[PDB]
Symmetry: C4
Subunit: 223 residues, 4 copies
């Protein structure tokens, strides 16, 4: 379960999205090194240009790559589902704007950890910070609070992200998350704890496609 | 006691307010899911327009809905009072402005958890950020520090909130709180600990009344 | 020792100051309620007008009033010295500006906890934020890191404060502190831990003297 | 005097950096002292080649985590002192938001009674009119958290952290640090459980030093084990 993550694992991400009727797709590829909580991914919009800012898609675009320290190993739900994996669902409410609803399957396809997602965004403002593209290309560090959900044999999580806006304000997104295993194998249901995240977004100056390069470090703490 | 909160519980909130002589009332309705620390409430001003910003009323408008993790269950004062409930009193000092004094009864009325409040505000500046309505419609995340009060058979709490102002500054409100059980049944007096809060305020575009929609997630930590 | 702080204790503060040759004095009076980490003080400049902002004097103007939770009672150095008390010395380095050197005696005189201080400030800029009075009248929350000093039979502490400047920046003050008992009685030398502080400054609209009203809540944590 | 014992008093420090950023070569020398018992350092740095081509704040993290205060209960988790006096190699990659990267390699060890940090730094792909080569970073420093992880294969540690650099327009520019430390000797070392270092720093100027220079005071403590 854990054993599938002891080395460098290749990652594939596919997203099909529709926000206020604007349809788009994203494909990402890279690799994860869970032993040290690290991911590097590169994403392209395969349908032309994204109709929303990249930073709004970061949280939707594999918490099985978090570093769980030794003493918290029995609290790593995400890896304990693998290889059959899990369904991750969220509702994401943007301050003063619309909402994303997402559903994703996270599992191994051969040697690759794959995250396949559907996203639906509704009630955004056409001249808001999202559809108006006024969010800075960067990302803050966040804390994801994880709770067992014994009835679903999985977890829930709750967290706010803070997105910098070009006028120097921050726009919050409140995330409600639930994860459910796909297989019937046993899983590790955790005591409450958090994941601390740090991310850096960057650009490849020679990629003419709409794109995002992402590096991330995630670790678990609080037991 | 705890058993009253194991599912979704309907909530009713009623506030009678007077700030610098301006009288108003608010009614709120929604539901709470203490198992995962969640609340959703919708509030209306039933007297016309509020004389103060909505964000100034959030803290006054049911800490019995906080998620206490399993190991901290013996520290959940709030639920241990139920159904007879508790009196919550606060003094709230606004930076460079007036103060709110509040008193509230929190208890079950039938299957509904009801928070009934009186609020009195004094010495506000007529052209300050409060009576001048210069506070942003949003809310930050906060830490509420909880202490047992053995003499009162209850608790005290202390915390600052930070309210964003439209000129990009923050205005602090310093909260002094005390809670006292209404019944004589035994209660759980806690070791020191905190509640971490996260909130999102929103608007219903079709509600013409002065109103606030609130979603909140609260969890206990620090033992 | 602890027993001296079980109720409300009156406080007296006296400061003699000289900053770049500008001499001034301050007297404060109020009371502290260490059981709940609280204090309220009112300070006046007894020599006319202060030559530096009030916020620069807050840290120098009784950590014996911090709330130590039950499990941390053996780590409360400050109360363990009482009534004979302690000498508190600091060096305070202001970002891009001068420094304060302070020495204070903190001890009971009769039933009153008295803080008597000498402050010497050097190398301030005449048109900096301090001597130019460009610091906002407010205060942030801070973390004071406490370490035993076995050779001195006391403690050291280190912390930065952050002072809001009227142009929207923050100016840091780095504090180096040391406390030494006055008596030869035994004291409690603590394990490393912190004090978390929260403060609110206010003004009495009918006090014509240069003055500061201060409310503060301080608690110990981290064992 | 081995490991921890070498740090019980005040230890003199020497720092030497050879740098090249987008082809601009420079050197820095620092001297001062560290008092690990209370997590404190005071250092003064000069650019010995004229003027620095990048802001001083971009060099602070590269310019001796052996001076951190490890509290008593965390003593078995102090990798850095356990290597001494033979010391360690510290390597980093530092990625600046919207700009280039630094790669650094440093040897940290005792030379006689002095703890010496000798560094090579190479910066690439910076923008000529960015905040770094354009000198638009404020002369100050924030407080940070450095997350430390054992690396059992290398007999050492890794660390990960973001710094946040204030920019003159009131924004912050993040630098993401990837770090690895490897002992130089073959003696045994202390491999830690996960934990963090909390940092606080103050930069200042000596009004009578005409050279390009930085005075730095810092306090670092370890935390996060039961
Ligand atoms: Na988001
Ligand atoms: Na996102
Ligand atoms: Na408030
Ligand atoms: Na409020
Ligand atoms: Na200060
Ligand atoms: Na101060
Ligand atoms: Na840096
Ligand atoms: Na740096």
């Amino acid at each position: 379960g854990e054993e599938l993550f002891t080395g460098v694992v290749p990652i594939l991400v596919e997203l099909d999205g529709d926000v206020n009727g604007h349809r788009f797709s994203v494909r990402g590829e890279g690799e994860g090194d869970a032993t040290y909580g690290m991911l590097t991914l590169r994403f392209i919009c395969t349908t032309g240009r994204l109709p929303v800012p990249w930073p709004t898609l970061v949280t939707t675009l594999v918490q099985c790559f978090a570093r769980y320290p030794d003493h918290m190993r029995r609290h790593d739900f995400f890896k304990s589902t693998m290889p059959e994996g899990y369904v991750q669902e969220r509702m994401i409410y943007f301050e003063d704007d619309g909402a994303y609803r997402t559903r994703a399957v996270v599992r191994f396809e051969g040697d690759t950890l794959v995250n396949r997602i559907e996203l639906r965004g509704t009630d955004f403002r056409e001249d808001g910070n999202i559809l108006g593209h006024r969010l800075e290309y960067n990302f803050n560090s966040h804390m994801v609070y994880i709770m067992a959900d014994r009835q679903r044999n999985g977890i829930r999580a709750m967290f706010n992200t803070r997105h910098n806006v070009e006028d120097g304000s921050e726009q919050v997104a409140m995330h409600y998350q639930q994860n459910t295993p796909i297989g019937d194998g046993p899983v590790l249901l955790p005591d409450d704890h958090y994941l601390y995240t740090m991310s850096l977004l960057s650009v490849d100056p020679n990629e003419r496609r709409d794109h995002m390069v992402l590096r991330e470090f995630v670790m678990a703490a609080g037991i």
